Design a protein around this motif. Structure first.
Motif, short mmCIF file in Angstrom:
data_model
loop_
_atom_site.label_atom_id
_atom_site.label_comp_id
_atom_site.label_asym_id
_atom_site.label_seq_id
_atom_site.Cartn_x
_atom_site.Cartn_y
_atom_site.Cartn_z
N UNK A 29 0.83 -1.18 0.00
CA UNK A 29 0.00 0.00 0.00
C UNK A 29 0.87 1.24 0.00
N UNK A 30 0.75 2.07 -1.03
CA UNK A 30 1.39 3.38 -1.00
C UNK A 30 0.41 4.46 -1.42
N UNK A 31 -0.86 4.29 -1.04
CA UNK A 31 -1.88 5.25 -1.46
C UNK A 31 -1.57 6.66 -0.98
N UNK A 32 -1.04 6.82 0.23
CA UNK A 32 -0.67 8.16 0.69
C UNK A 32 0.33 8.07 1.81
N UNK A 33 1.31 8.95 1.78
CA UNK A 33 2.22 9.14 2.90
C UNK A 33 3.66 8.83 2.55
N UNK A 34 4.53 9.17 3.52
CA UNK A 34 5.95 8.96 3.40
C UNK A 34 6.37 7.54 3.79
N UNK A 35 5.52 6.84 4.55
CA UNK A 35 5.73 5.45 4.95
C UNK A 35 4.80 4.60 4.10
N UNK A 36 5.34 3.55 3.50
CA UNK A 36 4.58 2.67 2.64
C UNK A 36 4.50 1.30 3.28
N UNK A 37 3.41 0.57 3.03
CA UNK A 37 3.33 -0.82 3.43
C UNK A 37 3.95 -1.68 2.33
N UNK A 38 4.94 -2.50 2.68
CA UNK A 38 5.73 -3.22 1.70
C UNK A 38 5.90 -4.66 2.14
N UNK A 39 6.24 -5.51 1.16
CA UNK A 39 6.41 -6.95 1.39
C UNK A 39 7.73 -7.38 0.77
#
Length: 57
Positions: A29-39
């Protein structure tokens, strides 16, 4: 989409993801923000990463 780590990152909390320079990370998830959810494709763990540490690969 797959990004590659430009720098090492050492996690400091429960929800972020440590990684090494050159590690390939899938965007969850990188829909919004400086921190992204990554795998991570190396560890298979999923957590938040600093977006400025990665570039498209």
């Amino acid at each position: 989409m797959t990004f590659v780590a430009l720098y090492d990152y050492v996690a400091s909390g429960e929800t972020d993801l440590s990684f090494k320079k050159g590690e390939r990370l899938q965007i969850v998830n990188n829909t919004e923000g400086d921190w992204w959810l990554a795998h991570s494709l190396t560890t298979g763990r999923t957590g938040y990463i600093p977006s400025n540490y990665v570039a498209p690969s």
